Amino acid sequence: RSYPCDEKVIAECSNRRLQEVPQTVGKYVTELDLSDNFITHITNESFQGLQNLTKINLNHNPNVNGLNITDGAFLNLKNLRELLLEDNQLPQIPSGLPESLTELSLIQNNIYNITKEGISRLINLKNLYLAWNCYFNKVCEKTNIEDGVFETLTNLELLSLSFNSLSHVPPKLPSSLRKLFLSNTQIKYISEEDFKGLINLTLLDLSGNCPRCFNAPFPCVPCDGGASINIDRFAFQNLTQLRYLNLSSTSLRKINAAWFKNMPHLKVLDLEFNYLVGEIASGAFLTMLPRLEILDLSFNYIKGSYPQHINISRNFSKLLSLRALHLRGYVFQELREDDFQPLMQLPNLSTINLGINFIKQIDFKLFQNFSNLEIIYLSENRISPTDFEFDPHSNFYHFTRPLIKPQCAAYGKALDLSLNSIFFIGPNQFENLPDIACLNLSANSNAQVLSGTEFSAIPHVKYLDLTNNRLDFDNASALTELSDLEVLDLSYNSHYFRIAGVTHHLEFIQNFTNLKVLNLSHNNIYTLTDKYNLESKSLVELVFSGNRLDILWNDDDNRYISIFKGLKNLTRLDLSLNRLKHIPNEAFLNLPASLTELHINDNMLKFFNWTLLQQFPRLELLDLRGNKLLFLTDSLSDFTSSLRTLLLSHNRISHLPSGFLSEVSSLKHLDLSSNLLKTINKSALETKTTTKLSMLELHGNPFECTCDIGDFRRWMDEHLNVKIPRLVDVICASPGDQRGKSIVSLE
Amino acid sequence: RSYPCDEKVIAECSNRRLQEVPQTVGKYVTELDLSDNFITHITNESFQGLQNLTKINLNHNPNVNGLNITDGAFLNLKNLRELLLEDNQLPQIPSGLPESLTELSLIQNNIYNITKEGISRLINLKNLYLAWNCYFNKVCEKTNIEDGVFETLTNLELLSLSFNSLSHVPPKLPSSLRKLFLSNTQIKYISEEDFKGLINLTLLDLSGNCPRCFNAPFPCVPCDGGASINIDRFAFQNLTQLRYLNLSSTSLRKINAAWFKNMPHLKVLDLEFNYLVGEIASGAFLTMLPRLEILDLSFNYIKGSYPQHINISRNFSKLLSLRALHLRGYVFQELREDDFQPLMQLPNLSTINLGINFIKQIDFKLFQNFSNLEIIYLSENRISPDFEFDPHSNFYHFTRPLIKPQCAAYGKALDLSLNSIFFIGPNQFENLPDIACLNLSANSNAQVLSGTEFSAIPHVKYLDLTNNRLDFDNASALTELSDLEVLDLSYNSHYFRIAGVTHHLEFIQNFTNLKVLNLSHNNIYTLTDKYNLESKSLVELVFSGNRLDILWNDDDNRYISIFKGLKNLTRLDLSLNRLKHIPNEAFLNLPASLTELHINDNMLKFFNWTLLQQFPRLELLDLRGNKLLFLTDSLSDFTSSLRTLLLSHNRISHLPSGFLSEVSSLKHLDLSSNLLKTINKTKLSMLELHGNPFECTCDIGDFRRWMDEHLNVKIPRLVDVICASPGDQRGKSIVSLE
Ligand SMILES: *[C@@H]1O[C@H](CO)[C@@H](O[C@@H]2O[C@H](CO)[C@@H](O[C@@H]3O[C@H](CO)[C@@H](O)[C@H](O[C@H]4O[C@H](CO)[C@@H](O)[C@H](O)[C@@H]4O)[C@@H]3O)[C@H](O)[C@H]2NC(C)=O)[C@H](O)[C@H]1NC(C)=O
Ligand SMILES: Nc1nc2c(ncn2[C@@H]2O[C@H](COP(=O)(O)O[C@H]3[C@@H](O)[C@H](n4ccc(=O)[nH]c4=O)O[C@@H]3COP(=O)(O)O)[C@H]3OP(=O)(O)O[C@H]32)c(=O)[nH]1
């Protein structure tokens, strides 16, 4: 049983409050992650017993001044390939690094000198990350790059120098380079010589040089006069393998078509945060890009300007390989059919993104004229009836999550109208739309009574997101025009459910033939009109967290005692966050016998009637985390043969009953973290049967570390197939000499 | 030093996990509150010490087996006036109650038998509370009322029997009654005899008998065929003093005017949850209410019906004393000027409540022609561009003020909250009166305010725009409101979250008289062009729930002076800003005028205490709920103004030397829920220490000594100042020892 790391050859040793490199790491280990510890010193002794190490991660030590690394500390590790030293306040590149390194990352340090002595003997480097050493209003020096320092790195494939003050492209780069990142480097001019020999390059990032600074979310310094980056006509002429070009925030007003003349493979062009309204309308460069797949022209708005219409050049029609066009933040009032003519015959154009344009009106019928749209993204418009802020490993100019949740988009064509002002759906709201399978109307403040006709023009919606609205459930036929509906999200429509005196009709649920997943979370449901029961022959999953079952199941009221019973196909039920202090026995028995997964976490349960598990023969997962439970039954196997996972974290359990660990044969994963256990007695340990337990969680219990723990420790020694994670957090509260130590580190 | 109660003569002893009546109560106590403890038995031994007890509260024992009370347990208490025994699962009225009692509460027990033996001996009773013993689907017995059980209570002024099954008004009630509460008692018939003797009654509650059960939020049983309650023509004949009549939810469709004939002082008439749409339209009874001040006709809607217009009888014009009219939940589409004609000459009608009517359109100009409207309440419409019920509250409606008092104090108030005014068009507020208090909360207003939207009502002083989604793209926003004093912009996160759109807060500087600004829960992390908040007038800024962790990031200097230009500021709230550290320069740039600084519920591990030298008026500093690991030993050096220092929920381990005994303006220090195991060996007036893990060895005697010598330093909740060690002492207050 490894300690302090979890081994599996990989050693997960991160975030463990470690103060030095442990001398206890399995000597077979090949990758070791010690990130986020409190390590302050690395010497030639730190890794002495571990010469099979391929990979070391030391990022973010010491985690709350800097990591002190001796010359040659690593130089004896002969197989070391990957060394991660991010966010360690290093004042220099460490001296005497091993020649074997293929990957070195020094992101987010204080290194202002890149020197031959540091780097040049690292002949095997493929990827070198030096970004984010001097930037914004950090107090730091201009980066000195020693002439020719990278010239000997003849296998170098990726070099990243972004977010440092460089002023010029470094000369003498190796022609092995595939990816060169030079974002936010204060380079104002790109000469013909700068990228001259780089015939293998596939990615060039020159974003944030001569930035567009209006409304910047960071301290931003424009080029004089807010001028554009100055890229020589021939700067790209030998970049024949280029696939990705990032020119975001280079204050461009003109794009020279001749930049692309030798660039037949360009697939992704990023031109966000420039001043390209004119070029978008004229667009001579568009001719050069018939193989482009992604064009991002987001946030090129003219500030203060809110024109009626977007002006797209007819030459967009040349972008014959286009798959996604991103046009956030152009900012305009109205989208008319004619305005997108140029895009309508593009054969592979799957995605159109018009997020964040403050658009007031759209002629929806225009989307039908497109060849092949799968994603119509119109969120955030005005349609109506550690202790650094930026992730160095992520795109700086846009978020890279999918525009549509994958689970919704998997059904078919997607229309996302979230975060607009469609406060009711009128009779003709969805006229002349493609055949939408995936519809997002989240956060429109929709207060309407859905009545069974609102979705008639798009009747094959299968995944409907209506979260964060204020729907008035006064009509039992609501949404029944959607016969194929499979997923329905009604989360955060509490507005009218909170009001006792208006009607709340949920009867429509029963009308769906194919409804599989229903989310009613965070609605504050405490009262329903006429019918008190939810019923469906199809429903598999009901999320009912964040409601008031404490009131629906009050002891003085019988009406809701069968509320979920009529959900006869149900396998997953979430009753978390319902302020439950007790469940009446009859209510529990009325939960569907079909269940396999039951969550009642984050309530206030003082007691749980285990005997009632007899009625749930298919029940695999029972989640009671975050309650106030005091005891377990001492004959749990009498009550279930199906239970595979039992989660009891964050309760007030102080005693295990005899045999409990091995009571139940089906039980693989028992979570007793953060309870009130002082020991586990031999009594809890006696079985006649082989335990099938695979994971037992125990961190955060106030263990009593005296001789009375020895039985449990031997049990541990005798059942290594039972994984106990976070041994470093399985801690003695007592006695004094033991307090804070892992129960494992005692004699 | 009292224990276990706090005494002040009143002993507050509630909610302290007490398992018996404590024997160490001040012998001089007149009022003892023992509510919410874990007490299971009372005996005539329980209170022996205490004979000048005038009042006992034993509500909610034992808390979370009834309270077992022996006969005559209370009998040797000669001054006991008032006994509270709510929510104790009592199976009977207890035997042997002292005859001194003027007030008895047995609300929320299991008592189904009201007998001479419990009650008839209690001759001084003014107030008797028997409500909520059998109701809803509780398992309980019909309520047996022993014939003439109240006949002897000839001082009795208030009798409450609500929420029990009674079936009949009990006969032989004393004519000393003022208030008779019989709500939800399953009484279907009110006979000419039922209120015989009761010529001094001023209140009668007959609500919930023959209830209107459609959409009930409780188990509701209608009378046969949902018939109305049956009230005899002459049943109110001799109820000449009535001021308050509650007939809510009695399924009335027809009101007999003659019921009010001899009741010309009726002030408050509650008719909610009936079927009175026809009566409201025609209503002869409205002609018999010359002195009525409050009429509540709420939730009389006909289900499924959504008429165009509300139909208000001309006879409303005879309600000459009306001050408030409640018409929630009539449910109608449109309010036209002429529809309120009959109200327009009532000289004292100050409040009109049309909440929850799903009203789509209103002609605002009609309000102009009323006599004296001060509260126009239109919240929750469709305008566009462990028992659940508190036994001491009204059951049919909330009783909080319609408008926050701090807003209404400014003058005429218009509440449009919880509608769909997602933008304010150019004539939205035309023909309104001179509105001073305006509520537009929760309209999902997404608009760019530009300085003209409130031109028609330019004297607004208190503007509530919370829970909207305002787009701050214009420096002139709201500047037409020259007199504005209070602006609430809480919960307008929507656009502030988005980096790429503009966020302009420059308009704040343009107000001469702005006193209070609440920017809470806006997630503010980036602003456009001007990085600083400026105002010569502003006194209080609430900035909680924003991202000062980002605004003051070490790598960015732009917001280091964000609040400095708030030159008049005395109160600043920076709680819930995810702060791990505040840059020293940022702290020093907070206004030197501050008297009150909150930075609670962040994640601060360090505080630079020396910086308090630049805050010479600072009286209150709140650092609760951070991760502070130690205190300065030099506090006297950095402030002579601090009176209150709140440090609860932090990680402090050691009180430094001479902290307490050192200076001086410091009245209140809160160190509760920290990590102190001891305190080692002065206007200080209060010292909180509950929830520390005190080591209760002999090392602790000095502190106890010190406690004994400084009895002018209150230490609240001594029962919660607990030893965590040693194992013997664990769970004990620190006041038990050698
Ligand atoms: C300018 O545009 C260029 C080209 O589009 C863009 O290049 C991309 O940069 C991002 C960010 O560094 C790269 O994405 C990373 O790449 C590797 C995958 O090989 C991953 O290790 C990273 O994932 C980790 O980090 C993510 C964020 O913390 C985690 O969410 C994830 O779970 C991983 O832990 C990450 O995805 C991307 O590879 C390149 N693109 C290409 C084609 O090389 C560049 O970022 C733009 N410039 C700026 C300043 O925005
Ligand atoms: N470029 C961009 N992308 C955005 C934006 N908002 C959301 N996204 C999403 O980020 C995700 C990442 O896009 P990004 O352009 O940064 O990077 C792409 C593209 O650069 C590139 N790519 C992607 C698709 C393609 O056909 N050809 C191609 O070269 O490969 C990256 C991996 O992303 P993936 O498509 O696998 O999720 C995309 O997923 P999505 O289709 O839902 O939309 C994109 C946005 O404003 N701009």
Ligand SMILES: Nc1nc2c(ncn2[C@@H]2O[C@H](COP(=O)(O)O[C@H]3[C@@H](O)[C@H](n4ccc(=O)[nH]c4=O)O[C@@H]3COP(=O)(O)O)[C@H]3OP(=O)(O)O[C@H]32)c(=O)[nH]1
């Ligand atoms: N009746 C009624 N009142 C409601 C409703 N919604 C909110 N309220 C508020 O509860 C509060 C209590 O009103 P309620 O009718 O229940 O009882 C009044 C009235 O019964 C009575 N009263 C009050 C004022 C008066 O002039 N004459 C009068 O007889 O004294 C009670 C206490 O009022 P308070 O001491 O808080 O000022 C009111 O304050 P508000 O003017 O803003 O409106 C009332 C509602 O739907 N119905």
Ligand SMILES: *[C@@H]1O[C@H](CO)[C@@H](O[C@@H]2O[C@H](CO)[C@@H](O[C@@H]3O[C@H](CO)[C@@H](O)[C@H](O)[C@@H]3O)[C@H](O)[C@H]2NC(C)=O)[C@H](O)[C@H]1NC(C)=O
């Ligand atoms: C309302 O409830 C639904 C149903 O629970 C929520 O959608 C579900 O969310 C979970 C994420 O918690 C998804 O499961 C996850 O899927 C990913 C991707 O496959 C997987 O990697 C994770 O391990 C996890 O299993 C689940 O797929 C998804 N279901 C559907 C139909 O989309 C929804 O998010 C809730 N809505 C709100 C606003 O909370």
Ligand SMILES: *[C@@H]1O[C@H](CO)[C@@H](O[C@@H]2O[C@H](CO)[C@@H](O[C@@H]3O[C@H](CO)[C@@H](O)[C@H](O)[C@@H]3O)[C@H](O)[C@H]2NC(C)=O)[C@H](O)[C@H]1NC(C)=O
């Ligand atoms: C029917 O209508 C009448 C109004 O005439 C309601 O009477 C009011 O009842 C409330 C709530 O019980 C009383 O308030 C309480 O008063 C005490 C004593 O002052 C106070 O300590 C409590 O905190 C609480 O405010 C109120 O006094 C009483 N009004 C009068 C004039 O006596 C009655 O509640 C209604 N019935 C139902 C079932 O709602």
Ligand SMILES: *[C@@H]1O[C@H](CO)[C@@H](O[C@@H]2O[C@H](CO)[C@@H](O[C@@H]3O[C@H](CO)[C@@H](O)[C@H](O)[C@@H]3O)[C@H](O)[C@H]2NC(C)=O)[C@H](O)[C@H]1NC(C)=O
């Ligand atoms: C936005 O911030 C304002 C200013 O803090 C909040 O209004 C203020 O709320 C406090 C209570 O949180 C009011 O003080 C209280 O007054 C009552 C009545 O006198 C008193 O009983 C309390 O002990 C306390 O003093 C304060 O008067 C009030 N200020 C104003 C101008 O109304 C407001 O609630 C915050 N908005 C939101 C949505 O949270």
Ligand SMILES: *[C@@H]1O[C@H](CO)[C@@H](O[C@@H]2O[C@H](CO)[C@@H](O)[C@H](O)[C@H]2NC(C)=O)[C@H](O)[C@H]1NC(C)=O
């Ligand atoms: C519908 O749109 C809403 C709003 O854009 C989406 O909610 C966002 O979802 C992402 C992905 O999980 C979260 O990280 C964001 O925080 C959400 N934002 C808000 C404001 O809620 C929602 O995911 C979309 N629905 C579908 C099915 O794609």
Ligand SMILES: *[C@@H]1O[C@H](CO)[C@@H](O[C@@H]2O[C@H](CO)[C@@H](O)[C@H](O)[C@H]2NC(C)=O)[C@H](O)[C@H]1NC(C)=O
């Ligand atoms: C403006 O209207 C809102 C919504 O009606 C009021 O907010 C309510 O205030 C009460 C009193 O504090 C709270 O208990 C309710 O929970 C609030 N409801 C919601 C939905 O926020 C607000 O008080 C009103 N503003 C003024 C100035 O009176």
Ligand SMILES: O=c1ccn([C@@H]2O[C@H](CO)[C@@H](O)[C@H]2O)c(=O)[nH]1
């Ligand atoms: O409702 C609108 C309309 C337009 N803009 C413009 O959009 C850009 C980004 O906020 C700015 O130029 C701003 O003027 C808005 O912000 N909000």
Ligand SMILES: O=c1ccn([C@@H]2O[C@H](CO)[C@@H](O)[C@H]2O)c(=O)[nH]1
């Ligand atoms: O938008 C509306 C319009 C009317 N109603 C009606 O209002 C009463 C209370 O909800 C019910 O009869 C219902 O029919 C609504 O609920 N919502």
Ligand SMILES: *[C@@H]1O[C@H](CO)[C@@H](O)[C@H](O)[C@H]1NC(C)=O
């Ligand atoms: C780092 O620790 C070493 C011992 O290995 C010590 O000699 C040296 O002074 C330290 N370096 C710094 C920069 O403090």
Ligand SMILES: *[C@@H]1O[C@H](CO)[C@@H](O)[C@H](O)[C@H]1NC(C)=O
């Ligand atoms: C592009 O679309 C056409 C259909 O017009 C199809 O033939 C081709 O396979 C698609 N190409 C890609 C790469 O999807």
Ligand SMILES: *[C@@H]1O[C@H](CO)[C@@H](O)[C@H](O)[C@H]1NC(C)=O
């Ligand atoms: C729902 O609305 C439809 C369409 O307006 C209407 O015909 C029907 O009567 C309503 N259904 C119910 C149950 O009221």
Ligand SMILES: *[C@@H]1O[C@H](CO)[C@@H](O)[C@H](O)[C@H]1NC(C)=O
């Ligand atoms: C919904 O189901 C119920 C009961 O099965 C049926 O009465 C009703 O007509 C169905 N409604 C619709 C609109 O299909």
Ligand SMILES: *[C@@H]1O[C@H](CO)[C@@H](O)[C@H](O)[C@H]1NC(C)=O
């Ligand atoms: C029960 O659930 C599954 C969904 O996985 C579905 O295939 C089956 O059709 C459902 N039963 C009914 C009656 O719809």
Ligand SMILES: *[C@@H]1O[C@H](CO)[C@@H](O)[C@H](O)[C@H]1NC(C)=O
């Ligand atoms: C109106 O109220 C005033 C003062 O509140 C009072 O003098 C007068 O009697 C009331 N008028 C009527 C018609 O009741």
Ligand SMILES: *[C@@H]1O[C@H](CO)[C@@H](O)[C@H](O)[C@H]1NC(C)=O
């Ligand atoms: C605010 O909007 C008004 C009305 O459109 C306009 O006159 C003005 O230019 C805007 N003000 C600012 C400061 O941009």
Ligand SMILES: *[C@@H]1O[C@H](CO)[C@@H](O)[C@H](O)[C@H]1NC(C)=O
């Ligand atoms: C607001 O204040 C500033 C100067 O303090 C001034 O420039 C601006 O014109 C004022 N705005 C208006 C609308 O008065």
